[PDB]
Amino acid sequence: GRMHSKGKGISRSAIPYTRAPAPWNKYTPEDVCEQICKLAKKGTPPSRIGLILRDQFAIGQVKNVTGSKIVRILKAKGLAPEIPEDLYCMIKKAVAIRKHLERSRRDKDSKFRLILVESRIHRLARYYRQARRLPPTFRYKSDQAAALLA
Amino acid sequence: SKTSGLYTARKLRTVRRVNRWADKKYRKAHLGTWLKANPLEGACMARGIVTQKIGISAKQPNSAVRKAVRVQLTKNSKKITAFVPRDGSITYIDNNDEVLVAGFGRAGRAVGDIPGCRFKVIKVAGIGLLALFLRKREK
Amino acid sequence: MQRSIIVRRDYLHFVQKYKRYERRHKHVAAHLSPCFRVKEGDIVTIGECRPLSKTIRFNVIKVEPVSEAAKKRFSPF
Amino acid sequence: NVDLLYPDPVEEQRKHKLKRLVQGPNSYFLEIKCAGCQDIVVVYSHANTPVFCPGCTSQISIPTGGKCAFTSQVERYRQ
Amino acid sequence: MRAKWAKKRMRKLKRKRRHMKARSK
Amino acid sequence: VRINVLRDALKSICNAQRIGKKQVIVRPSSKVIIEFLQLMQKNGYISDFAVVDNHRSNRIVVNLIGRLNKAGVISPRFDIPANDIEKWVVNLLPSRLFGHIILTTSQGIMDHIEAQHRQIGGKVIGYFY
RNA sequence: GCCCACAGCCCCCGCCGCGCAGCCGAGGGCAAGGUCUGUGCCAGCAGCCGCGGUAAUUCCAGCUCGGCGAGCGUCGCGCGGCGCUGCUGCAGUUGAAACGCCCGUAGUUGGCCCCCCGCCGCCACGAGGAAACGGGAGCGCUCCAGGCAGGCCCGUUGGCCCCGCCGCGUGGGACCGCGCAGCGGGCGCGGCGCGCCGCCGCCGCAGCCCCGAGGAGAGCGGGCGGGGGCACCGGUACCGGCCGGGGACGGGUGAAACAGGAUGAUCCCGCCGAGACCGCCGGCCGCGCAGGCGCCUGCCAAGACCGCCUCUGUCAAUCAAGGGCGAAGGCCGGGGGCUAGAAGGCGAUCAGACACCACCGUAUUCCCGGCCGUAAACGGUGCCGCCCCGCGGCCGGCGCGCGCGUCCCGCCGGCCGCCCAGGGAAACCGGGAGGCUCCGGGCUCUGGGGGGAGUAUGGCCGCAAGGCUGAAACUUGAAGGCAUU
C-alpha cells in the first residue's frame, strides 16, 4: 500500500510479454534516440518524453525498439537531468506546499502533507546517494530547495 | 506477537527477563523484598522468647478463640504471632518460656480461620509441643 | 586518533534456548601506519602485535578501500 | 472440463490484467485516418497526451479516463 | 459514576497532600 | 510485505485441496517452491505442476490429486544438526514411520530420511505430511 | 583364626543361643468405618474444600482399617506440576491486556533473478587440550550401593564417548547475505621463476544493461469527495432596542411557585442593532492520519482512487529514542458577547432536597495568538503480506456489449449487510475473531488472580490543573467473561 496513505489501490501499467518492435514499426533505434534528444533539449521530463513517443508517435516501449530505457539513452548523450527526475518532482511539490503554508500558518492539514513529502524526499535521497547517482555531499535543505530546482 | 527472526535472540531474551517479573510468584521468590519483610528471615524455624499470650477470634464463618503466643524473635527482635497447635496446648506454653516457631505452612500466608497469623509453635522450652500433647515427655 | 584507528569487528553469538542469534560488535584499537591511509568504513586486516599501548595490541597489516556512502551494513567477515 | 494453464481468451480478458495468468496490456494501437488525407495516423488507444493529424495543425485526440475520444473527422481503421 | 468520583477524591487528596508537603519544604 | 513466499504457496495449496479444487495457482515462482513441489511429486502428494512465465516472478499451477493432509513452513529456517532430525520429526510429523520433513542441505533440498542416510543436516525449509 | 601401627569391625569357625515397628491418616482431593464414646460454633480440627450450634462420616478417645516402611510426619526452599513466562509453546472484541493518531532513526525484517568464484554464517568430519562426574565395553564387591577388578589371562584388562571447544583444519556449499573494478596477449625471470607496475591498439573478447514485482516512488489524463486553510458572505431564529396597534393577563409546569402586566405586558406588524449557527435535503452518503468535517462567491496548495505498451529500478515493511497532530473541558495573554449555561442565587417538592423540574445568571461557548496532551480517543479488535463461499445493497473510476438507457455485464479501490465452511468458553467473527494443540510470513506495543494502588516515593514535563513513568509492605479465596434457568 501507499507509504504515507492507507490506500491499497493497484493501477499498474503492465508491459507487453513479447519485447519486440511493433509489426507496424518503421523507425531505426538511432532514429528514436535522435528524437529523444530533441525532447531532452526541450527539457521535457523523461516520463513525459516516453508518453510523447507513445502518443504523438507510436513507439509503445523504448526498450522494445531502441534496446535501452529512456534515462540510459539520456545518460549516453550526457543529456541526463542532474537530479533524478523522481526526486525533482517531490522537491518541486514540497516547494509549492511550503509557499502556500508561508501565507497560511493555520492550515494544520497542509503541514501534515509537508512532513510526509519531505520524509519521502529524505528516504529517496539516501537511496540515490548509496547508489552514487547523487553525490555523498547531497543533503536536503528546505531553504535551498527552490534554488536547487534550477 | 512472537517476533521471530534468525538474528532476533536479544529482543526475546529482554522480553522474557522483563516479563518474567510480572508474576507474583517470580517476584516473591526473586525480588527478595520479601526476604527483608520475612520475620523468619529465610529460615525454616526461629527461636524467640514469648513476650505475650492472647486469644484470636477465628474468622467467620468458623467461630472459636484460637490460642496464640505473641513472640519477639531472638534473631531480629521482630514480632511474630504464633498459633499453638493441638487441643488445649496453650497450657503447655508459659510467658517468657522461649519457643521455636516454624512456618504455619502457606509460605507467609495466614492459614485457615486464624486471621493474619503466619507462624506456629513447634517446640516449648526444649521439648516438642506435639510430644507434650502426646504425653511422650512432661513439662 | 593520532596514527591509530578503532577497528570495529562484527560477529554473531548463538543462544541455544531461542535458536535465533544475536549480532554482537566489539571495538579494538589498532595502530595505523602512515604508509596506509584509511577512511571510516574501510576494511583493515589487523595483525596482532606487542602490547603497544593501554588499548593497542593490534596493528593494521593491509587496507582495502570502500565507497563514501554504501550504508553501515553489518559485516562479520 | 475446466483446465488451468489453458484458459478461454474472451472470458479471461474480464480478469484484471495483472490478475490474468500472464500480466498483459489491455491497451492496443488503432490506425485512425486523417480528416481529408488518405494518410493513416496510428494512435495509441489510451492517449492522455494530445495527438495531431499529419500536416493538419489541429487536435486529433480528446484525453479521457480510458480510451481517448477523437476530436476531428476520424476513421477508426483499428489495428 | 463511582470510578470518576473516586478519581476526583484521589485528585483532591493529592492536591492537599502536595500542598501540605510544600508548607514543610 | 510478502516475505516468506513458500508460506503463501503452501497455505493456498492446503486450502485449495481442502475444498478439493483440482488446480491451485501460486503467484510467485521460486527455486525453493519448485523443489518442495518436486519432493511432493516424488512422494506423490501433488499430481502435477507447471510454471507459466510472465517475464516476472513466474506463476505456478499445481494439479492436486486430493491426497495431501497438511503442508507447512518453519520460519526462521533453523539449522538442524544430523543428530536433531530425530527430535524435529517427533514434534512436527505424524508418527515416526510416515510423513516427510524437508531440509535444505549442502547436498541439496532433501527429505529427512535422505539426509538421515547421508548423516548430514541443514536448515528446515518446511514439512509435508 | 582372619584382619589391624595396635586394636577393633568384617568374615571364617566351634560352643551356646533369648525376632524385635514405627509414623501419619480413614468426608473429599486421597488409599482407608458413613463405626462406638465424650463434647455441644465451645474445645479443637482443617495446606484447600470445609467440620463442630445434641443424633460431629471431620474434634477428643478406644475400635477396626489404610498408606509407607526402619523409617514416617512437619517446616523453609529449589525443580517439577505451570503451554501460570510460552524458542518450541501463552494471551490481548467482551476474562488482565493494540500505544488516540501520523511521521520517524537505531533495531529487526525483506519479492523474483545468474548454477559452477571469493568471503560470511551453515552442515559434516577431524585435530588440539584435565581427570573425576555423567554415560558406556568387560568383570558375580555372596546380591546391592560399589569398585576397577580379575584370573594361568587381546603385550590379562581398565575400551570408548562427552570442554558448541563460539577458535583451528578439511570437504560440501543447498540456503544465507556481500563483492564498486574492463579483460586477453607482448615485452617480463622487466636484477636466481613468477607476481609487479608501467606501456603497446596490442585485435584476440557477443568487450560492458537479467528482468519490470496484482513491491514501492515519480509522471500523465480523467472524473470524485460535509478533506484543509484564508477572505467574502446569505438566511432565519434566539436576544436586545424602536414605531404604530389593541386592551388583561402573561410565563412556567407533572401540578405549581418566583421574576414579567395600566411605566399598557403577552400578542400582532414594520424597523434597527448585536453575536452565534448552518435547518428541511442529510444517509448502512462520502472525504480525512486520527481528532474531525455541511451558507454564498471566490482564492490557494493538496489527497486517495481509476485508467495507462509513461519513468525509476529495491528505492521497501514495522518501528525504541526523536518530531508533529490531537474532541471536549481547563488555562494564559488579546478581542467579542446573542444564545445556552458548571459556579452562584432563587421557586416549588420532600422527613430533609441545599438534587432532579421552573426562574435568573458568572466563567465558558465564538474569534486570535500561545499552553494543556487527555476521552467509552471504541470498531472496546496495531500495522504491512497471502489465501480466503456464496449472496445482496452503496460510492468513485474504467472497460465489454447491445436499443438506448444515468440499461446489461464485469474489473479495480473503498463503505456496508447476510451467511456456508472454519473458529470460539460462549455472545458472536466470518473482507476474520478463519486458514492455529495438524500450533512458526514479518514487525512493534501491552498483559500474567483480586485488592493495596495508579497510591507512596524518585525522575521528567506543565503557568497551573495535572500528564507520563511508577512501587512495596500488607491483605485475601476469590475477582472476572459469556450464556442458562
Is residue A93 located within the same domain as residue A146?
yes
Closest residue in D to A54 (Cα) is D44
Asked if C12 has any chain B CB less than 8 Å from its own CB, the reply is yes
Peptide bond into C65 cis (omega under 30): no
State the residue for C-alpha cell 486469644.
Answer: B55
Positions in chain G where some atom is under 7 Å from a protein CB: 24, 41-53, 59-61, 74-79, 82, 84-92, 98, 102-114, 119-125, 164, 166, 171-180, 209, 211-223, 227-230, 288-291, 300-317, 323-326, 368-370, 382-389, 397-400, 409-414, 434-436, 438-449, 454-457, 465-467, 472-477
Provide the phi-psi class of D36: left if phi over 0, else alpha when psi is between -120 and 50, else beta. Answer: alpha
Q: Is residue A32 part of a domain?
A: yes
F54 chain-A contacts, CB cut-off 8 A:
17
Is residue A108 located within the same domain as residue A144?
yes
CA angle D54/D56/D57 to nearest 5° reads: 105
**F52·D3 Cβ contact <8 A:** no
Is residue F117 located within the same domain as residue F81?
yes
Q: Report which of F63, F59, F12 is spatially closest to residue F40, judged by C-alpha positions.
A: F63
Query: CA-CA distance, E16 to F11, in Å (whole number)?
Result: 62
From residues 8-37 of B, which are strand G contacts by CB within 7 A?
Answer: 8, 11-12, 15-16, 19-20, 22-29, 31, 33-34, 37
Residue B46 corresponds to which amino acid?
A
Query: CA-CA distance, A97 to A110, in Å (whole number)?
Result: 7
Residue from C39, C71, C73 whose CB has the most chain A CBs within 10 Å, to mutate: C71
Cα dihedral: B76, B79, B80, B81 (round 10): 160
Number of domains in chain F: 2
Per the DSSP assignment, residues forming a β-bridge with C45 are: C62
Size of interface B-C (CB pairs under 8 A): 23
Q: Is residue A88 part of a domain?
A: yes
Query: CA-CA distance, A17 to A27, in Å (whole number)?
Result: 21
Cα dihedral: F72, F75, F81, F83 (round 10): -40
Domain boundary among F18, F40, F68: F68
Closest residue in C to B5 (Cα) is C20
Query: CA-CA distance, F120 to D58, in Å (whole number)?
Result: 76
- Distinct helix (H) and strand (E) counts, chain B: 4, 6
C67 chain-A contacts, CB cut-off 8 A:
132
Q: Which residues of D28-39 are buried (b: 16+ CB within 10 A; e: fewer)?
A: ebbebbbeeeee
Domain boundary among A61, A80, A99: A80
Strand ranges in chain D using DSSP code E only, listed in sequence order: 29-33, 40-44
Is residue A76 located within the same domain as residue A86?
no
C-alpha separations of B124 from B68, B137, D9, D21, E15 in Å? 13, 11, 100, 91, 53
Query: Cβ of residue A72 near strand G, that is under 7 Å?
Result: yes
- CB–CB of B92/B99 below 8 Å? no
| DSSP class per residue in B12-52 | HHHHHHHHHTTSHHHIIIII-HHHHH-SS-S-SEEEEEEEE
| DSSP class per residue in A30-62 | HHHHHHHHHHHHHT--HHHHHHHHHHTS--S-H
Query: Cβ of residue B128 near strand G, that is under 7 Å?
Result: no
State the residue for C-alpha cell 497455505.
Answer: F11
State the residue for C-alpha cell 529517496.
Answer: A124
**F115: helix, coil or strand?**
helix
Count how many residues are written for chain F: 129
Is residue A54 located within the same domain as residue A67?
yes
User: CA B38, B44, B50, B55 torsion: positive or negative?
Assistant: positive
- CB–CB of A104/A110 below 8 Å? yes
Q: Is residue A93 part of a domain?
A: yes
Domain boundary among A47, A80, A113: A80
- CB–CB of C44/C19 below 8 Å? no
Q: D21: number of CA atoms within 13 Å, CB side?
A: 17
Measured in degrees and rounded to the nearest 5, phi and psi for residue F123 equal -80, 140
**Is A7 annotated in some ligand binding site?**
yes
User: Chains with ≥3 Cβ pairs under 8 A against D?
Assistant: A, F
Is residue A64 located within the same domain as residue A113?
no
Is residue A150 located within the same domain as residue A92?
yes
Q: Is residue A135 part of a domain?
A: yes
Query: What is the distance, to the nearest Å, from the Cα of residue A48 to the centroid of all Cα atoms in its chain?
Result: 9
User: Chains with ≥3 Cβ pairs under 8 A against A?
Assistant: C, D, F
Domain of A95 in residue numbering reads as 81-150
Is residue F55 located within the same domain as residue F77?
no
Q: What are the sequence ranges of the domains in chain B?
A: 1-139
Query: Cβ of residue D79 near strand G, that is under 7 Å?
Result: no
Asked if C70 has any chain A CB less than 8 Å from its own CB, the reply is yes
Q: Report which of D29, D40, D70, D39 is spatially closest to residue A54, judged by C-alpha positions.
A: D29
The approach used to solve this structure was: cryo-EM
C22 chain-B contacts, CB cut-off 8 A:
7, 9-10, 13
C-alpha separations of D76 from A26, B114, D41, D73, F102 in Å? 20, 101, 10, 10, 59
Count how many residues are written for chain C: 77
Per the DSSP assignment, residues forming a β-bridge with C6 are: C29
Which nucleotide has its C1' atom closest to residue B13's CA?
G87
Peptide bond into F28 cis (omega under 30): no
Query: Cβ of residue D49 near strand G, that is under 7 Å?
Result: yes
Measured in degrees and rounded to the nearest 5, phi and psi for residue B6 equal -60, -30
- The separation between the first and the last C-alpha atoms of chain C, rounded to the nearest angstrom, is 24
Q: Report which of F62, F89, F73 is spatially closest to residue F127, judged by C-alpha positions.
A: F73
Expressed in percent and rounded to 5, the helix, strand and coil fractions of chain D are 5, 20, 75
C71 chain-A contacts, CB cut-off 8 A:
130
The residues after which chain B has a C–N gap greater than 2.5 Å are none
To one decimal, the resolution in angstroms is 3.3
**B9·C12 Cβ contact <8 A:** no
Domain of F13 in residue numbering reads as 1-68
**Strand (E) or helix (H) holding F23:** strand F23-26
State the residue for C-alpha cell 550526457.
Answer: A78
Q: Report which of D64, D74, D66 is spatially closest to residue D41, judged by C-alpha positions.
A: D74
Q: Report which of A50, A56, A65 is spatially closest to residue A13, judged by C-alpha positions.
A: A50
Provide the phi-psi class of B79: left if phi over 0, else alpha when psi is between -120 and 50, else beta. Answer: beta
Measured in degrees and rounded to the nearest 5, phi and psi for residue E13 equal -65, -40
Is residue A105 located within the same domain as residue A74?
no
State the residue for C-alpha cell 534468525.
Answer: B6
Number of domains in chain A: 2
- CB–CB of A25/A67 below 8 Å? no
Is residue F18 located within the same domain as residue F32?
yes
Is residue A89 located within the same domain as residue A142?
yes
Expressed in percent and rounded to 5, the helix, strand and coil fractions of chain C are 0, 50, 50
Which nucleotide has its C1' atom closest to residue F1's CA?
G385
